[PDB]
Structures are given as structure tokens and as C-alpha cells.
Ligand binder design. Sequence first.
Ligand code: HEA
Ligand code: HEA
Ligand SMILES: CCCCC/C=C/C/C=C/C/C=C/C/C=C\CCCC(=O)O[C@H](COC(=O)CCCCCCCCCCCCCCCCC)COP(=O)(O)OCCN
Ligand SMILES: CCCCCC/C=C/CCCCCCCCCC(=O)O[C@H](COC(=O)CCCCCCCCCCCCCCC)COP(=O)(O)OC[C@@H](O)CO
Ligand SMILES: CCCCCC/C=C\CCCCCCCCCC(=O)O[C@H](COC(=O)CCCCCCCCCCCCCCC)COP(=O)(O)OC[C@@H](O)CO
Ligand SMILES: CCCCCCCCCCO[C@@H]1O[C@H](CO)[C@@H](O[C@H]2O[C@H](CO)[C@@H](O)[C@H](O)[C@H]2O)[C@H](O)[C@H]1O
Ligand SMILES: CCCCCCCCCCO[C@@H]1O[C@H](CO)[C@@H](O[C@H]2O[C@H](CO)[C@@H](O)[C@H](O)[C@H]2O)[C@H](O)[C@H]1O
Ligand SMILES: CCCCCCCCCCO[C@@H]1O[C@H](CO)[C@@H](O[C@H]2O[C@H](CO)[C@@H](O)[C@H](O)[C@H]2O)[C@H](O)[C@H]1O
Ligand SMILES: C[C@H](CCC(=O)O)[C@H]1CC[C@H]2[C@@H]3[C@H](O)C[C@@H]4C[C@H](O)CC[C@]4(C)[C@H]3C[C@H](O)[C@]12C
Ligand code: CUA
Ligand code: NA
Ligand SMILES: [Zn+2]
Lengths: 40, 513, 56, 75, 91, 72, 258, 227, 44
Amino acid sequence: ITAKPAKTPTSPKEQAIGLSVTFLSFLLPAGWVLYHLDNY
Amino acid sequence: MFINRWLFSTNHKDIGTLYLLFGAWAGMVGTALSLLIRAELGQPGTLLGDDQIYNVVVTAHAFVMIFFMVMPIMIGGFGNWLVPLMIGAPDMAFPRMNNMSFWLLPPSFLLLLASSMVEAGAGTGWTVYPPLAGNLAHAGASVDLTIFSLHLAGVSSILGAINFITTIINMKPPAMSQYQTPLFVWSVMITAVLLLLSLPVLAAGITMLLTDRNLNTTFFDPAGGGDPILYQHLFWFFGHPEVYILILPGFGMISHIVTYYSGKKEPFGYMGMVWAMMSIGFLGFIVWAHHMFTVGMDVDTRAYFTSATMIIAIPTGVKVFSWLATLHGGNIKWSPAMMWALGFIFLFTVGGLTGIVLANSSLDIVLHDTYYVVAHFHYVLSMGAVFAIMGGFVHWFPLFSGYTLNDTWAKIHFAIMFVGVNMTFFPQHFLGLSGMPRRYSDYPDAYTMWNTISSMGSFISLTAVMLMVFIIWEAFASKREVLTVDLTTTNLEWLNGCPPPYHTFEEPTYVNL
Amino acid sequence: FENRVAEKQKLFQEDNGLPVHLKGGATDNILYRVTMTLCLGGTLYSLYCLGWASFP
Amino acid sequence: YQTAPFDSRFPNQNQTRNCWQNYLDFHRCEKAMTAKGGDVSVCEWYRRVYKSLCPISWVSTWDDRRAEGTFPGKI
Amino acid sequence: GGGVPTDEEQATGLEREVMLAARKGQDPYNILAPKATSGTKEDPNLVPSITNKRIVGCICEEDNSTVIWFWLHKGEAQRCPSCGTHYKLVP
Amino acid sequence: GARTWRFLTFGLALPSVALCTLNSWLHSGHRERPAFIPYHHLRIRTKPFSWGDGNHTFFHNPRVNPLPTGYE
Amino acid sequence: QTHAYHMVNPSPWPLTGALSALLMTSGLTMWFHFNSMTLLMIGLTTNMLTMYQWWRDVIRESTFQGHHTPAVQKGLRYGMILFIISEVLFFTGFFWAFYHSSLAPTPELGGCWPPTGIHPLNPLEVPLLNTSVLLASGVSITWAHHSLMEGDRKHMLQALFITITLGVYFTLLQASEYYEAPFTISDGVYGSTFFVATGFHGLHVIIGSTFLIVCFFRQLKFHFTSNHHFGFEAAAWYWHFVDVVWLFLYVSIYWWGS
Amino acid sequence: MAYPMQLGFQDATSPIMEELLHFHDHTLMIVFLISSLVLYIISLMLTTKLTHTSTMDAQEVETIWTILPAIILILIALPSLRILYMMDEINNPSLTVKTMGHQWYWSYEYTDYEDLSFDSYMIPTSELKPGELRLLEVDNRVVLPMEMTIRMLVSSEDVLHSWAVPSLGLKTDAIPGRLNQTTLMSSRPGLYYGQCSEICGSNHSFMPIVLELVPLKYFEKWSASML
Amino acid sequence: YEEGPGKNIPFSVENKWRLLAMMTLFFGSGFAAPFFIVRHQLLK
Ligand code: HEA
Ligand code: HEA
Ligand SMILES: CCCCC/C=C/C/C=C/C/C=C/C/C=C\CCCC(=O)O[C@H](COC(=O)CCCCCCCCCCCCCCCCC)COP(=O)(O)OCCN
Ligand SMILES: CCCCCC/C=C/CCCCCCCCCC(=O)O[C@H](COC(=O)CCCCCCCCCCCCCCC)COP(=O)(O)OC[C@@H](O)CO
Ligand SMILES: CCCCCC/C=C\CCCCCCCCCC(=O)O[C@H](COC(=O)CCCCCCCCCCCCCCC)COP(=O)(O)OC[C@@H](O)CO
Ligand SMILES: CCCCCCCCCCO[C@@H]1O[C@H](CO)[C@@H](O[C@H]2O[C@H](CO)[C@@H](O)[C@H](O)[C@H]2O)[C@H](O)[C@H]1O
Ligand SMILES: CCCCCCCCCCO[C@@H]1O[C@H](CO)[C@@H](O[C@H]2O[C@H](CO)[C@@H](O)[C@H](O)[C@H]2O)[C@H](O)[C@H]1O
Ligand SMILES: CCCCCCCCCCO[C@@H]1O[C@H](CO)[C@@H](O[C@H]2O[C@H](CO)[C@@H](O)[C@H](O)[C@H]2O)[C@H](O)[C@H]1O
Ligand SMILES: C[C@H](CCC(=O)O)[C@H]1CC[C@H]2[C@@H]3[C@H](O)C[C@@H]4C[C@H](O)CC[C@]4(C)[C@H]3C[C@H](O)[C@]12C
Ligand code: CUA
Ligand code: NA
Ligand SMILES: [Zn+2]
């Protein structure tokens, strides 16, 4: 496949932010429930 | 305009996009349920402290992965996007009915999530066998909400099957015979025929269960002269076709992917591939009682079901060897989609072979209701379906979105997922052979080591899922717009550009005789 | 009865930009609003019922 | 008599009808022997076979229904 | 006993356009498969279009399962990249 | 043709319905109801019905449909 | 476009239909478990409103706007055949339940069919009359079809009126049968198989009769041409399906099962 | 019973389980070979710069691809079905025992001669005697004679259960209103464990089966003591 | 209707950070839901 250069390139730092926010969106809520299973 | 476009759609592409979004969301739910299963099993003892909740989680895991992730993605998503494009059709035959097949699924899912929130849930298994699923052992609304979820899903898929069969038969170019349609289109037509014939039988059976629960019928209640085994026949008469429904569109996508990344104009042995899919579809209706080898049926019945089940390996092997023969002599492009497809061929083969082990009723006595069965279907169904979905998704994402993925990230994603699913499911073969039952919240101490490893594998696949979401974000974030793709002469779905215009084939293709 | 299909053809082919479900006139709008209000209101009521049924 | 022998009438995994038929046969024979004041020892083969094969709860439920007049088999 | 309208009396819209075109032996709505010419440079297949390009699928030989797809542009005749059959667009 | 199917409608089909109507009407008398026996495979009640007192079937006929405890 | 297919206007009815399904199912749940008919009556109302407006729009698109070209009509033919096939398979499940139960009657029944304490209907009385009624309606609908093809308005309307009258007669006879039946849906697997299989059939007779009534009013309003009348064809196919399911019920449940 | 890090079947306690072990060894060799061939061929197709992208004729190779798999399936089915018909063959049992499944325990009935019956419950982890097995012990074991053909009849008084003993090759569903038959023959004395094998609700994981196989003389002494 | 890359979807890709928030809420809500349903059943 061939493509145009990125209109809005995503730098290594921008990727670290997006990856971090993505991982945290999965891990924090599930982590909160699993940590508190005793309280349940 | 936003409500008209996305709630009132009569467009095959927009409806396909709705199905892909729905399915991806369902996949997150299904995955979360799978991790809760493996967390309960990841050390000896109890985690949840409530084995009814464990049983509800197992039940919901299966319904979400089958009815809300695989079928919506393969048939509603790839089917709606690709089938009209691959035959040069301007839309589906019934573009407004198509939209109702989609909009039935959110209500269906809401009924499933209502089942789990009222009373103590439906802790039945996805088989929903009476009397456990009856009004004594599962009093209250949960099982009825599960039945209604399945009615709505069933109507969605029956109307979808009518739409796909009509589209594929009626809306090709007048010169194009059935034997000039791409293999993916064949795979959807065959899948749709299986849905049309199988789902009504499930609908009959679960309706009988509804009436036994609420109208004092006794179809499945021996006190009234009924028989729990009748439910099992009606369920599995649907359920075996259902497992071929889950894989057939996957076989179609694999044929396209292997052909494309081998640099070929065509798959090896086209008419053999059509023959094999039709043979699998037909044989799929005459084998169901291999789900019932321990219920007490007659020896000659067991002999027949063993023998009929083994026959399916012949057309299946023609497809596997044909994929290998499509690679043969290729200018191989090691794209991430090709990696998904090669993973599919191998992992599907492993799971199909453990299916042949299980087909032997004698050995099935010892393997039935063990982790051997769980291992079999997580190879052939879970890995097979998911690997075909991820291959199709990374191959066609640029068509659907107009944007390219980062190929290096997509290869990393593949590598993580390959390790995770094999670490999760391979040890379940040992657990099965050594006698660990399925549908257990805890296990005798001897089974600890392979359960521990399996649960560690489940977290590796979670890391892959999270990375997949980041990879999709990065593609939409960077906005690398597609210009050209190779092999458009034998991949018509690409020839209107990326993404294609809302209306395609307003002027149909010219094909002469 | 008399054949008035030509008069309906003219009505439903009028170049007024209306979608077919509203092209009959003001009565179509009323019936659509009744249908959608019962569907959306009913759905909100079903969610309330879910909330009630989710607890003892 | 050790246990119920193989019966070519009931050669398969489902033995429900074998239990039912011997229960009926015992009670039909018992009624026939009692009605002429004859000898129930003649019914002994059926008694041993149904006692061997039939779940206690099935026997107890069938006995209760015979006493109630709600037993649905013909004796 | 009469009183049922005929298609000639009552068909409308696209149904009527298709009905009237068929009476004239015309196929504006692409219901029929066009018959190939010899496909030489002197006798190209003539591909009607309402615009300046149209997708052609070429079934190069009878009973081929593989169709070869390409855009045919207004201007000089183009050739099927598999069999070299000539096609000419006729706006 | 239409003439042939009308001929079948009036000459065979509707006469058949008239004869079956006469047959039914000649056998329409009320049958003597059988002694009540509280058989456990009949008058099933695993959950109350969602109407009336929970114990009457939807098209309950007092003359011929006994309750679990007998005729009303 | 230079193809003959129908690009449908964006429509709200798919969404209202899907929500009507949620309201009917959540409604049945709330009737069976929470002693309330409210959601169920909203769902039934929205379902009827959705089917009315959706099929009204199909009439507008075809009779009034001309979108049903031969290619579109061909697609609808396939769609209706496939829909009937799905309905055949739904009934097959109920026949399988009937044959499973009746061929291997369990000890709870008395190990016989019909079960101890079941007094079946005489299949030579109202069931035979119902058989003559639906067979006769298959003849009258064929007369209606030929009358329409031959351009005969009066005889099409008379034949279709007779067909509908026979469907209504069947429905009133079956209602009467249900009320007079000395067995109920709660009379074990005999009552279960009888009422669920004949009850889904009776529902399909009411649906089919309703479809014929729509065709009757469209015919009164001159919608059909002598050549173009797919709604009538589909209603006839569906009506023949209802007849054939009855003949299988009659032979299986009423006659062989008595 | 299973032991830690176990890969394969529990050691065979019955002649039919022995047969199943030999049959699994045969079948697994085929599974390994076919799995390995497919992986090898993938690697072969992917490891050459040589190309052939023109249309290939499929007819000749499809004969090999259908005949060879058909032969393999026959070679699996023949021994498979021999064992199936062995496990059905008329045996003269010397003893009949019934088991009834319940939520969540088994009951056993020995009614050939005396009305002996008892219930069999899992020993809770908090009550295990030192060295006893978590989730596997019961209070009342199924005492049976070794080296004798036994008829087991299996049913349920509530939901579906399934009566299993892996080392004897046994799994028979427990269905209310149905009496399912299986044959049991142990070559050895000892304790043989199994677990409920049809989901039956919240305590499915916790209603095990324990057979206690003893010489006939000890079985008779046990039966006589139970009066 | 709007055509072309980023315009054939029911969500905006005009701003990659707003997009990250929407994708986070979308996939996160699905992944979280079973944990919160388990919590709801345990708290009964
Ligand atoms: C994608 C879904 C899918 C697919 C395609 C299959 C495919 C097969 N399945 Fe499986 N199966 C499931 C999903 C699937 N299955 C699920 C979900 C269950 C569990 C349901 C539940 O209980 O919850 C199940 C359970 C199931 C059972 C019941 C086991 C039990 O509960 O005790 C059996 C019994 O025979 C079976 C057999 C097979 C066979 C023989 C095939 C065949 O179609 C496989 C054919 C493929 C090959 C053989 C490999 C390729 C072939 C070659 C390379 C040629 C040469 C090969 C030979 C000569 C052997 N499967
Ligand atoms: C398609 C079907 C499917 C899929 C994909 C899966 C996926 C997984 N399943 Fe399974 N599972 C079943 C079907 C499936 N499952 C069924 C039918 C049962 C039996 C239920 C019963 O007994 O009644 C079962 C049961 C089952 C058990 C046995 C429970 C028991 O017996 O007690 C276990 C145990 O480990 C398990 C684990 C997993 C894990 C860890 C995953 C996954 O975590 C593996 C990794 C895969 C993913 C993480 C999916 C990724 C896909 C997406 C996120 C979609 C992306 C979308 C786009 C790109 C558009 N599942
Ligand atoms: C006259 C000819 C036809 C009449 C039609 C019936 C009238 C009422 C209901 C209509 C819907 C019918 C469909 C079939 C469903 C089940 C039962 C219907 C059969 C019937 O009417 O049976 C009656 C019982 O109804 C009962 O329980 C009550 C029934 C009412 C509640 C039914 C709710 C269940 C709905 C199930 C939904 C399933 C939908 C499937 C969708 C599948 C899509 C994939 C029989 O009366 P009885 O007093 O027991 O015996 C007579 C004694 N004198
Ligand atoms: C008191 C009542 C309680 C019961 C309520 C339940 C519902 C009852 C509904 C009955 C069905 C009515 C269907 C009416 C369809 C009208 C639209 C129609 O018939 O549309 C026709 C197309 O057919 C088409 O779409 C064909 C459309 C096919 C419709 C198929 C309908 C059968 C549906 C069954 C419903 C599901 C049942 C399943 C339950 C288990 C229009 O084309 P023509 O006729 O060629 O006209 C064009 C000419 O005029 C040109 O010259
Ligand atoms: C417990 C209760 C749960 C049940 C919930 C019920 C589920 C959903 C609510 C149903 C709402 C129905 C509303 C009407 C649907 C009409 C569909 C229809 O009639 O669809 C037609 C196509 O299907 C055709 O013909 C042939 C197909 C016609 C099918 C009609 C509808 C069937 C709905 C139920 C079917 C279940 C099947 C039973 C077998 C298991 C028209 O296709 P369109 O794309 O519209 O237009 C195309 C244009 O060219 C026409 O001018
Ligand atoms: C199956 C998918 C799950 C995979 C595992 C997820 C990995 C863990 C992610 C982190 O999750 C968090 O962990 C914190 C602990 O590290 C918790 O803080 C908890 O504990 C803290 C330290 O004890 C306190 O300060 C906080 O108040 C308290 O909520 C917090 O709630 C939770 O969100
Ligand atoms: C246009 C959009 C649609 C909007 C939705 C309309 C919502 C209407 C709310 C009324 O709610 C009702 O309240 C009744 C009284 O509180 C309940 O009666 C029922 O519940 C009673 C509880 O006291 C019981 O006595 C009986 O079962 C019964 O009368 C009934 O369940 C419930 O529906
Ligand atoms: C513009 C939109 C307006 C929407 C208005 C909604 C219409 C219904 C609202 C009232 O709800 C009802 O309330 C009754 C109690 O007051 C319920 O009695 C129910 O409970 C009875 C028990 O006495 C049972 O006989 C029956 O299930 C039933 O009548 C009835 O079921 C339920 O529907
Ligand atoms: C006089 C009128 C003409 C209709 C017309 O051409 O507009 C006739 C033609 C056929 C008639 C119908 C048919 O004769 C069949 C029915 C006969 C019944 O006696 C009255 C209602 C009945 C349904 C009739 C109503 C009405 O009188 C119709 C519609
Ligand atoms: Cu008893 Cu599982
Ligand atoms: Na645990
Ligand atoms: Zn060519």
C-alpha cells in the first residue's frame, strides 16, 4: 500500500501518551474492582 | 443529518461500520469476562466467593463472544462492507431491513446484561440446558431475559441471512455466474444458508424452554412426559451449524488474504474451495449428536455420529492444502495481515485435529465435559475466528477508513497475541487428558500448575488487546491517507478508492459474455 | 370506487425533498412523532424497570 | 439370583423401560395371584428384577400413586 | 369482466422507464449482459458510459472463475491486462 | 384459467365445506365428562399463570377443565 | 443511477422495530415476573405502528413511485421464499418435539400415547371441517390469482373475499375448539405439543388472513396490475404455507397422535 | 486420581481404559504428524525466492488431498468403533448399583438383596484429615468388589449431573426420569476418584465420586455389616 | 453527507486528543462493565 505523509504526525512522545492513557483506561477500573473484592 | 445517517441508515458501508464498532465493543466485554474466568482459576481456592457468579460469567463470556463479537464483525461488518463491493452492487437487496438487523443487536445485548443484573444471573452455561435452566433451579427473570436476548439476536441473523442470500443471488452483474464470485462472497452465502435453517430450530427450542418456565408446558419435564434430552437435540441441531457459521466467513477472508499477500491473482483450486465450503455446510447439519455422546444414546447412533463427524476433515483438508498451494510460488509480502492468516492456518489445523480426537465417541466418554473440549474450541473457534478477524481488520482497515496502520506496531500486536493465546490454551489439553472438568470454579490441587500458566497467558492476550486499541488510535491520530494498493485487477472492493464514496456502482460495472 | 392511483403517483413523486415516510403530509409527521415518542419513552421506562429489578 | 440378567428387550444404555416393565409385571402378577387368593411367590422373578434396577424414589412414588388411584400404567 | 389496470396504463417511475426502453430493444439500466465483439484493435468492445470512465470486468476465457477489473477511460481503447482484449469507452 | 378455478371453488371446494359443516353440526352435542382423577402428569403447576388467580388456564372451560383439586 | 435497483430513503422504521422488539420482550418479562402488562402493551402498540408505516412506505415506493423494476421484484420473490423456509424450520422444531414425546411415551404418561387421562378431539369432527376450510381457501385464492392475471376486478375481489372468509371461519372454529377442549396447555406433553404447535399455526393463520385483507383493500384501491402484484403473490405463497402446515398438524397431532 | 504436572491420561484401572490409552496413543501420533506437516509445509512455502504466479492446475493434487485423508480417517475409525462395540458388548454383571445425582452430592443404592442406601458428600477443606485430598474426598465411598463386572445405573432427583471416574473410562449423564446404564470392572483394589461432569449449579465443582475397590470376601463382609 | 477519510464515521477524528478521550470512554466502558456487574452481584 502507498500513502501520503501523515497530515498530523504522532511523535514518539505523543505515542507514549496515547499508549499510557489507553492502558490506564483498561487497567484502573478493573484494578479498583479487583483490589476491593474483599470489601465486596 | 447525524441521526439520519447513523440511526436511519440504508447504506451497506455505514451499517458495516456500525457492526464493526458494536463488535469491537462486545469484544472488550467478552475479553473482560474471560479474564474474570482465568482470575478465578489462576490460583487454587475461591476468588469471587460465589460460584453462581462464576457460572454467570462463563455463560455471558460465551454469548458475548459468539453472538455480539464474532457474528456481528464477520457477517454484519465485513459482510456488509465487502459483499456489495465484491459483486459491483449498489447496496444490499433490502437496505432498510439491513438497518433493523443491526439495531436489534443493542437491545439483544441489553437483555443479556439485564439477565446478569437481576436475581443471581443465568449460571447455566451457554447451552442453557433444563432442568438447571428451568423455573425451579433458576427461578426468576434471568433465564427468560437470556432467552429473549437470543430471540432478538436470532431475528437479526435470520433477516440478515435473507438479505445476504438475496443480494448474492440477485445482484451480481448479469454476465457473472456464481462461479465468478469471490470466495468471501461464497463464504457469506453459505453461512447465511446455515443461519436461515439452524436459527429457527434454536428459536423453537428456547421458546419451548420459555413456555416450560412460564406457561406450565412440560416439553423438557419428565413429570409431564417431557425429556431434557429433547432440548439438547434442538439446541445442538442449531449449535453444530453455528460453529461452522462462526468459521466460514473466516475461511473466506483467509482465502482473500493468502491470495493477496502471496502476490497471486487467484486462490489455488477455486472450484475445490467452493465444493469444500458447501460440503462443510451440508455435513454440518448431520453431526450434532457428537455433543451428546455421554447422555445414553444407542451404540449404533454413536457409531453413525462418530463416522459422519470424521468426514468433515476431508473437505476441510482440501481448504488447508489449497491455502498452502496459494502460498506456493508466491512473491510473499510479510504484512501483518499475512502473519494473522499464517497463524490462522496452523492454529485452526491444531484445533480441527483435536476435534477429530473428540469425534471418536469412545474416547469422548473420557474427554467430554473436560478442559480438552475447552482447548479444542479455543484453538479452532477462539483463535481461528479471532485470527481471521484481525487479519481481515488490518488488511481492510485502509479501505474502510482511508488511513494506513503502522505495520511495525501491527506486527508487535500479532507477536504478543500469538504468545498469549498459546500460553493460555495449550496447557488446557493436559488438564483435559488428566480429567479436569470444565465449568469448575476450583480444582483439585494436582491441576494447579497448568491452571496457573493458563491464567498468566490470559494477561498476555489482554496486553495485546490494549495495544490494538492504541494502534487504531495511532492510525486515526496520524492521518496517513491511502493513495494506491496493488492487485486491484483481482480485488474489486479497492477500485473505488479509500474509503469508497457513500454511493458506489451507481453506474454498474461492464462485464461481457 | 374509482382508480385514483395517478393522483397518489403525482403526490409521492412531488419534488419537495421529503423522505417517503413523510411524503403523505402532516399526518405522517404526527404518526412518526407518536411512534418515536412511545419507542423512546418505552425504552427509558424499560431502563427504569431494569434499575428497579436489579435490587431486592 | 445375584442381579438382573441382560434382557434382549432392553439392550441399550437407557434402562428406564426395563425398570418400568418389571414393576408393572410384578404388580400385575401380584393382583392376579391375590384375586383368586393364589400364591405371590409366582411373581418373585419380577420382584427381584424391579427391586435390583429401579431407583428407590421411583418405586416409592409409583407405590404412593397406586394407593392414591393416580398410577397411570395399567395393572 | 375487466377493471384491472395494465402496466402500460399504470406503471410509473423507473419501472415504466425500464418497460418503455425494453419495447425499443434498449438497455439503459444494464439489465442484460453485453455480447463481446472479437475484441481486436479494429473491433474493440464498445463500453457505454454516462461519464468519462467505467469499471470493466473481463472474463478472459469462458468458465474462468477469476474476473479482471480495471477502469476504462475515455480516449484510445485500452486492453485487458490479462488477455489483451480491447475495450473502447463510448460516452 | 379463472373460469376453471371458480368451477372448482363452487363445484368441489365449497360443497366439501358444506358437507363437513353438516357432519360437524350433527356431532356437536356435549359429551359426558369423565370422572376426575388427580394424575400427576396433568394439571401441571410449576409456576402460577400470569393472569386470574394463577390456577386457571387461559381458555379455561369450567364444564370440561378440572383444576388440580377437581371440577369447579 | 444506471442500474435497476432501489436505493431506499433513510428510514426510522428499523430503529422503531428494534425498540418494539425490546419493549415486547422486556414487556413479557415484566408480565411473567413483575405482575405488569404496561411495557408489553407499549411494545405491541409500537410494533403494529412500525409494521403499518414500513409496509405503507413499500406501497408508496412501488405503486406510487415506480421503484419495483423486474430486478427489484425478483429480489422480493427470493426474500419471501427464504422467509417461508425459515418459518418451515421453526415449525419443524415443534414437530420434532411432538414425535419425540409421542413415539417414546415415558412412564409418567402410562408409557402410552395418548397419555392416560387424555381424551383427544375426534379428528373427523371440527378438525376435518378445518381441513376442508383451509383446502377450500387454497382453491379460492388460486381463482383470485387467475382472475387478477386475466384483468377481472370483480371476480378477483369475490374470490379473495371468500378466501378471507374461510380464514376467519378456521380461526373462529379453532377458538371454539380451544374453549371446548377437555385438555389444556398444562396437561403434560400432550397439551404442550397440541397447544404450542396449533397455537403458532393459528397465529400464522391470523397473520396470513391480515395479509390477504391488506391485499383486498389494495385491490379495492386499484393498486395491482394484471402483471404486477407481488404483495398478492407473497400473500398467496404464505397462505399455501399455512395450509400445508395445517395438513401436517392434522395428520400428525390430530389423526396419528389420537 | 491426577497428580501434579500430569500431561496425559490417569493410569488405566479397567481393560476398556487400557484400550482407550492405546487408541489415544495411535490417534495422537497422527495428530502430531499432520500438525507438524502443515507447519513444515508453511515454512517450505515461505522460504524460497523462486516464483510461479500463473494459474496452477488443481485436479491431480486434489486426488492425493482427498484419498490420503480418507484412508487416515478409516485407520482411526476402525479401532475407534471396535472399542465402542466392546464397551457395549453383553456382559453378565454379578452386581447392580444405582447412583442418583442431587444438588450437590451423590446417593447410592445397593438393592440386589438388601435395601442399602446412603448419601456421599464432599469432605469440606476445613474437615480434611491430614494427607487427604482437597475437593476429592467423600464421607461415604462407593464400596465395590474388584475383578468383577458391575452394572452401574445412573439417574438424578433434580437437575442434570454426570457420574465420572476417569481412571475406569467412565462418564454417564444423570438425567431425571431416565435410568442410564454403564459397566464398571476394576483390575485392581484401591481408591478411584471422579467429579460431577454436567454443570448443575453453584456447587458443580464440589460433588465428587470415590470408589473403594476391595476383594469380594471384603465386599460381602461390608454388605453383611450394613444390616 | 460528508465523504472521504475521517468523514465516513460516527465519531470525529478532527482532534487526536478528543479522539483519545472518546476511544478511552468507548473501549474502557465495555471492558469495565463485567467487573462492575460482578461487584453488583457480590454486593447483593
Ligand atoms: C470455529 C468453530 C468450530 C469448528 C470449525 C469446529 C470444528 C470441529 N469440531 Fe468442534 N466445537 C466447537 C467449535 C468448533 N468446532 C465448540 C464451540 C465446541 C463446544 C461446544 C460446547 O460444548 O460449549 C465444539 C465441540 C466439539 C465436539 C463435542 C466434544 C464434547 O463436548 O465432548 C466434537 C465432537 O466430535 C467436535 C468435533 C469437531 C470436528 C471433528 C471439527 C471439524 O470440522 C474439524 C476439521 C479440521 C481438521 C481435521 C484440520 C484440517 C484438516 C487437515 C489438515 C486434513 C487432514 C486431517 C485428517 C486426516 C484428520 N467439536
Ligand atoms: C468466539 C468465541 C470465543 C472467544 C473469542 C473466547 C475467548 C476467550 N476465552 Fe472462551 N469460551 C467460549 C468462546 C470464546 N472464548 C465458549 C463458547 C465457552 C464455553 C462457555 C460454557 O461452558 O458454557 C468459553 C469458555 C471459556 C473457558 C472455560 C470456562 C469454564 O469451563 O469454567 C475459559 C477458561 O480459560 C475461557 C477463556 C477465554 C479467554 C482467556 C479468551 C480470550 O481472552 C482469548 C483472547 C481473545 C481475545 C482477547 C479477543 C480479541 C478480539 C476483540 C477484542 C475484537 C476486536 C474487534 C475488531 C478488530 C473489529 N473461555
Ligand atoms: C385461535 C387460534 C390461535 C390463537 C392464538 C393464541 C392466543 C393467545 C396468544 C397468542 C400467541 C400464540 C403463540 C403461541 C404461544 C404460546 C401459547 C399459545 C397457544 C394457546 O392459545 O393455548 C392456550 C393457552 O394459552 C396460554 O397459555 C397463553 C398464551 C398467552 C401468552 C403467550 C406468551 C408467550 C409468547 C412466546 C414468544 C415467542 C416468540 C418467538 C419469536 C421467535 C423469533 C426468532 C390453550 O388454552 P388452555 O386453556 O390451556 O386449553 C384450552 C382448554 N379449554
Ligand atoms: C390482529 C393482528 C395481529 C397479528 C399482527 C402480526 C402481523 C401481521 C401482519 C401481516 C402482514 C402484512 C404484510 C403487508 C405487506 C404490504 C406491502 C406489500 O405487499 O408490498 C409489495 C411488495 O411486497 C413485499 O414487500 C412483501 C412483504 C412481505 C411481508 C411478509 C409478511 C409476513 C410477516 C409475518 C410476521 C412475522 C411472524 C413470525 C412469528 C413467529 C408492493 O409490491 P406490489 O404488491 O407488487 O405493488 C406494486 C404494484 O402496485 C405496481 O404496479
Ligand atoms: C418474543 C417476541 C420477539 C419477536 C420480536 C420481533 C422482532 C422484531 C420486530 C419486527 C418489526 C417488523 C417491522 C416490519 C419489517 C418489514 C421488513 C420487510 O418487509 O422487508 C422487505 C424485505 O424482506 C422480505 O421481503 C422478506 C422478509 C420479510 C420479513 C418480515 C418481518 C419478520 C419479523 C419476525 C420474523 C421471525 C421469523 C420466524 C422464523 C423463526 C423490504 O425490505 P426493505 O429493505 O424495507 O425495502 C426494500 C425496498 O426495495 C422495498 O420497496
Ligand atoms: C484483569 C485486568 C486487571 C489487570 C490488573 C490491573 C493492574 C492494576 C492497575 C492499578 O489499579 C489500581 O491499583 C491501585 C493499587 O496499586 C488501587 O489503589 C488502591 O490501593 C491504593 C494503595 O493501597 C490506595 O491508595 C487507593 O486508595 C486504593 O484504591 C486502585 O484502586 C486501582 O485503580
Ligand atoms: C409514552 C411513553 C411511555 C411511558 C411509560 C409509562 C410508565 C407508566 C408508569 C406506571 O407504572 C406502573 O405503576 C403501577 C402501580 O404502581 C404498577 O401496577 C402493578 O404493580 C402494582 C404494585 O402495587 C401491583 O398491585 C400490580 O401488579 C399492578 O397494579 C405497574 O407495574 C407499573 O407499570
Ligand atoms: C401516553 C402513554 C401512556 C402509557 C400508560 C401505560 C398504561 C398502563 C399504566 C398502568 O399500569 C398498569 O397498572 C395496573 C395496576 O394498577 C396493572 O395491573 C396488572 O396487575 C393485575 C393484578 O391485579 C393483573 O390482573 C394484570 O397483570 C394487570 O392488570 C397493569 O398490568 C399495568 O399495565
Ligand atoms: C359493487 C362493488 C364494485 C367494486 C368496484 O369495482 O369498485 C363490488 C365488486 C365486488 C364486491 C365484493 C364481492 O362481491 C364479495 C363480497 C360480497 C358480499 O355480499 C358483500 C361484500 C363483498 C366484499 C363485495 C363488496 C362490494 O359490493 C364489491 C367490492
Ligand atoms: Cu452435579 Cu455438576
Ligand atoms: Na477458583
Ligand atoms: Zn481479459
